[PDB]
Design a protein around this motif. Structure first.
Motif, mmCIF file in Angstrom:
data_model
loop_
_atom_site.group_PDB
_atom_site.id
_atom_site.type_symbol
_atom_site.label_atom_id
_atom_site.label_comp_id
_atom_site.label_asym_id
_atom_site.label_seq_id
_atom_site.Cartn_x
_atom_site.Cartn_y
_atom_site.Cartn_z
ATOM 1 N N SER A 168 0.844 -1.222 0.000
ATOM 2 C CA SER A 168 0.000 0.000 0.000
ATOM 3 C C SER A 168 0.870 1.258 0.000
ATOM 4 N N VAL A 169 0.268 2.393 -0.359
ATOM 5 C CA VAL A 169 1.009 3.683 -0.346
ATOM 6 C C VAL A 169 0.125 4.775 0.265
ATOM 7 N N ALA A 170 0.769 5.804 0.815
ATOM 8 C CA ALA A 170 0.114 7.052 1.284
ATOM 9 C C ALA A 170 1.049 8.177 0.830
ATOM 10 N N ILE A 171 0.623 8.923 -0.192
ATOM 11 C CA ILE A 171 1.461 9.975 -0.838
ATOM 12 C C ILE A 171 0.788 11.333 -0.635
ATOM 13 N N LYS A 172 1.500 12.254 0.000
ATOM 14 C CA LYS A 172 0.925 13.576 0.294
ATOM 15 C C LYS A 172 0.842 14.423 -0.972
ATOM 16 N N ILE A 173 -0.323 15.032 -1.147
ATOM 17 C CA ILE A 173 -0.591 15.991 -2.249
ATOM 18 C C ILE A 173 -1.224 17.231 -1.634
ATOM 19 N N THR A 174 -1.331 18.281 -2.445
ATOM 20 C CA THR A 174 -2.021 19.529 -2.057
ATOM 21 C C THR A 174 -2.697 20.060 -3.315
ATOM 22 N N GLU A 175 -3.368 21.198 -3.215
ATOM 23 C CA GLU A 175 -3.993 21.774 -4.424
ATOM 24 C C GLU A 175 -2.962 21.877 -5.553
ATOM 25 N N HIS A 176 -1.765 22.397 -5.261
ATOM 26 C CA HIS A 176 -0.753 22.621 -6.329
ATOM 27 C C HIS A 176 0.320 21.525 -6.368
ATOM 28 N N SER A 177 0.503 20.770 -5.285
ATOM 29 C CA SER A 177 1.502 19.670 -5.283
ATOM 30 C C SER A 177 0.781 18.367 -5.640
ATOM 31 N N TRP A 178 0.731 18.028 -6.929
ATOM 32 C CA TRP A 178 -0.023 16.829 -7.373
ATOM 33 C C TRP A 178 0.512 16.360 -8.717
ATOM 34 N N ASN A 179 0.154 15.134 -9.090
ATOM 35 C CA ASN A 179 0.633 14.548 -10.364
ATOM 36 C C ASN A 179 -0.488 13.691 -10.966
ATOM 37 N N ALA A 180 -0.728 13.841 -12.270
ATOM 38 C CA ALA A 180 -1.830 13.097 -12.929
ATOM 39 C C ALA A 180 -1.521 11.596 -12.990
ATOM 40 N N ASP A 181 -0.257 11.232 -13.223
ATOM 41 C CA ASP A 181 0.138 9.803 -13.330
ATOM 42 C C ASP A 181 -0.047 9.109 -11.976
ATOM 43 N N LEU A 182 0.166 9.828 -10.871
ATOM 44 C CA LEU A 182 -0.029 9.236 -9.523
ATOM 45 C C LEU A 182 -1.515 8.899 -9.336
ATOM 46 N N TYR A 183 -2.415 9.809 -9.707
ATOM 47 C CA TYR A 183 -3.853 9.470 -9.589
ATOM 48 C C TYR A 183 -4.175 8.259 -10.475
ATOM 49 N N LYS A 184 -3.593 8.220 -11.679
ATOM 50 C CA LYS A 184 -3.836 7.094 -12.613
ATOM 51 C C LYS A 184 -3.381 5.782 -11.955
ATOM 52 N N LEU A 185 -2.215 5.787 -11.296
ATOM 53 C CA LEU A 185 -1.694 4.571 -10.605
ATOM 54 C C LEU A 185 -2.642 4.128 -9.484
ATOM 55 N N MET A 186 -3.394 5.054 -8.883
ATOM 56 C CA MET A 186 -4.355 4.654 -7.817
ATOM 57 C C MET A 186 -5.332 3.602 -8.377
ATOM 58 N N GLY A 187 -5.566 3.610 -9.693
ATOM 59 C CA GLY A 187 -6.455 2.624 -10.338
ATOM 60 C C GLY A 187 -5.808 1.248 -10.457
ATOM 61 N N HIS A 188 -4.558 1.111 -9.990
ATOM 62 C CA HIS A 188 -3.791 -0.164 -10.046
ATOM 63 C C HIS A 188 -3.800 -0.839 -8.667
ATOM 64 N N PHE A 189 -4.632 -0.331 -7.756
ATOM 65 C CA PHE A 189 -4.789 -0.885 -6.388
ATOM 66 C C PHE A 189 -6.209 -1.440 -6.266
ATOM 67 N N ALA A 190 -6.443 -2.325 -5.299
ATOM 68 C CA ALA A 190 -7.791 -2.893 -5.069
ATOM 69 C C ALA A 190 -8.743 -1.772 -4.650
ATOM 70 N N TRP A 191 -8.204 -0.744 -3.989
ATOM 71 C CA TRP A 191 -9.027 0.397 -3.515
ATOM 72 C C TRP A 191 -8.136 1.627 -3.338
ATOM 73 N N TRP A 192 -8.715 2.829 -3.419
ATOM 74 C CA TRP A 192 -7.907 4.058 -3.219
ATOM 75 C C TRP A 192 -8.788 5.178 -2.665
#
Ligand code: SAH
Ligand code: BDF
Ligand code: GLC
Ligand code: GLC
Ligand code: GLC
Ligand code: GLC
Ligand code: CL
Ligand code: CL
Ligand code: MN
Ligand code: ZN
Lengths: 300, 109
Positions: A168-192
């Motif tokens: 599992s992972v827990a990756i800190k984001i904010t309004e401006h600190s974020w990445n589109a590929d990281l959200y896409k990878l969340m779809g590679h887990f059983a749940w997010w």
RNA sequence: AUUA
């Protein structure tokens, strides 16, 4: 701090918000910047990591013997590692905990690597990846809020190459600190989910949590759309600051589950294996020695 | 030659020096065993638990340990009345090897 | 982002 969510460690992004197709808007929290009242002498990051761990306790995390945890962005302007101290308290005794930061700091981790995260290498897989990295330059907003690279490029590659299946992972984001590929990878887990700590409800900060890595896309996520959905949720759902959950630590330690660890080739990952991974009942990786290193650029 | 970091800090405090800040205090039940140094927070109703590395003078000052660090990766329990200077408490006190508590704060060896 |  009177809504039923005030007694929880924080609030997870509701499923209906994840299914929208919002356009990205400026984040505007009605309580932006407000400070939480913390127990006497408790640091903000001890309270924040305590609430993240209390939330992770409610998920199907795989917890094998000799668990392997790596913590990125573990240093601070204080020269100490409050988050690492909470992880060390939360994780079962004997858990291998490695932490890292661009700047020197003193840690309770078994091993600490100092340098840009892009210099960190490991020929081993991990059961849990925690990142609190944030680029100070993210504060200099001079243009459109676009997907950020930097350490996020490293984290996406680290998850795809070094996270054990079931991990599992827990990756800190904010309004401006974020990445589109990281959200896409969340779809590679059983749940997010995107989790907001109650002590920092006045910040656009959230932890993107991927629970039980499947190493293949379970759902297709458009990262630009999902971050827009996240901001829409935050803009229309004010969260009251709350430290209530910090006062009951009786069930805080992560339960040692002795989750089975197996080595298997991608051609042996059938639907029966995927079901075990999806329920936090299996970790797939080698059980060899843990070796880490930081690349050093030599200059005259 | 060897720089005596311990005596230098005790002298600094004696001259009104401000105690080392940023020792990491942990959230805990305060219903623990009360032992001095433990693998997890064990503060009792009269103690505070702190992350070990942040309470070690040698770790904090980036100096060689007088020996291995016995606090790094552990939790130190400090009497609440002395929790304002955890680094100073770990230096000015000793742990009862048998019992496991601080000498003069629950045991005597 | 490393509250106050
Ligand atoms: N590219 C990068 N590589 C490594 N660390 C980075 C980084 N970009 C930012 N960071 C680190 O991210 C951290 C954000 S502050 C982290 C606070 C810490 N988690 C705590 O427990 O208090 C900073 O220490 C910063 O140095
Ligand atoms: O080091 C002791 C302490 O009380 O100093 C002031 C603050 O830095 C506190 O977090 C810290 O625990
Ligand atoms: O501890 C449980 C808490 O959550 C419940 O949902 C209630 O909202 C609150 O009154 C209660 O104290
Ligand atoms: O079906 C999804 C469910 O299982 C997942 O593994 C999560 O741990 C849980 O929060 C979620 O409700
Ligand atoms: O490692 C922590 C250091 O780097 C962080 O990026 C912060 O901007 C800085 O305030 C801090 O001293
Ligand atoms: O400071 C605003 C609020 O946040 C705090 O964390 C407490 O939970 C609450 O008692 C307080 O009113
Ligand atoms: Cl970028
Ligand atoms: Cl648990
Ligand atoms: Mn804040
Ligand atoms: Zn030390």
């Amino acid at each position: 701090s009177n809504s039923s969510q005030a007694w929880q460690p924080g609030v997870a992004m509701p499923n209906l918000y994840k299914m929208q197709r919002m356009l990205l808007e400026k984040c505007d929290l009605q309580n932006y910047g407000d400070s939480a009242t913390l127990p006497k002498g408790i640091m903000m990051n001890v309270a924040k990591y305590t609430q993240l761990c209390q939330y992770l306790n409610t998920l199907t995390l795989a917890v094998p013997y000799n668990m392997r945890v790596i913590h990125f962005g573990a240093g601070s302007d204080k020269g100490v590692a409050p988050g690492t101290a909470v992880l060390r308290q939360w994780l079962p005794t004997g858990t291998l905990l490695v932490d890292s930061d661009l700047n020197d700091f003193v840690s309770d981790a078994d091993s600490t690597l100092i340098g840009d995260c892009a210099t960190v290498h490991t020929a081993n897989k991990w059961d849990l990846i925690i990142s609190d990295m944030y680029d100070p330059k993210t504060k200099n907003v001079t243009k459109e809020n676009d997907s950020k690279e930097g350490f996020f490029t490293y984290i996406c590659g680290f998850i795809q190459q070094k996270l054990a299946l079931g991990g599992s992972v827990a990756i800190k984001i904010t309004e401006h600190s974020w990445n589109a590929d990281l959200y896409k990878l969340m779809g590679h887990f059983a749940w997010w989910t995107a989790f907001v700590t109650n002590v920092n409800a006045s910040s656009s900060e959230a932890f993107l949590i991927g629970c039980n890595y499947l190493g293949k896309p379970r759902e297709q996520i458009d990262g630009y759309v999902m971050h827009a959905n996240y901001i829409f949720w935050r803009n229309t759902n004010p969260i009251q600051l709350s430290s209530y959950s910090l006062f009951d630590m009786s069930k805080f330690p992560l339960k040692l589950r002795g989750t089975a660890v197996m080595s298997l080739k991608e051609g042996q990952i059938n639907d029966m294996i995927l079901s075990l991974l999806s329920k936090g009942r299996l970790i797939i990786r080698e059980n060899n020695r843990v070796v880490i290193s930081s690349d050093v650029l030599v200059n005259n | 030659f060897a720089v005596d970091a311990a005596k230098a800090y005790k002298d600094y405090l004696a001259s009104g020096g401000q105690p080392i800040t940023n020792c990491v205090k942990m959230l805990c039940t305060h219903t623990g065993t009360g032992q001095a140094i433990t693998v997890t927070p064990e503060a009792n109703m009269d103690q505070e638990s702190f992350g070990g590395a942040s309470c070690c003078l040698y770790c904090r000052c980036h100096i060689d340990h007088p020996n291995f660090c016995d606090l790094k990766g552990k939790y130190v329990q400090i009497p609440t009345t002395c929790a304002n200077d955890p680094v100073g408490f770990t230096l000015k006190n000793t742990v009862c090897t048998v019992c496991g508590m601080w000498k003069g704060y629950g045991c005597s060896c």
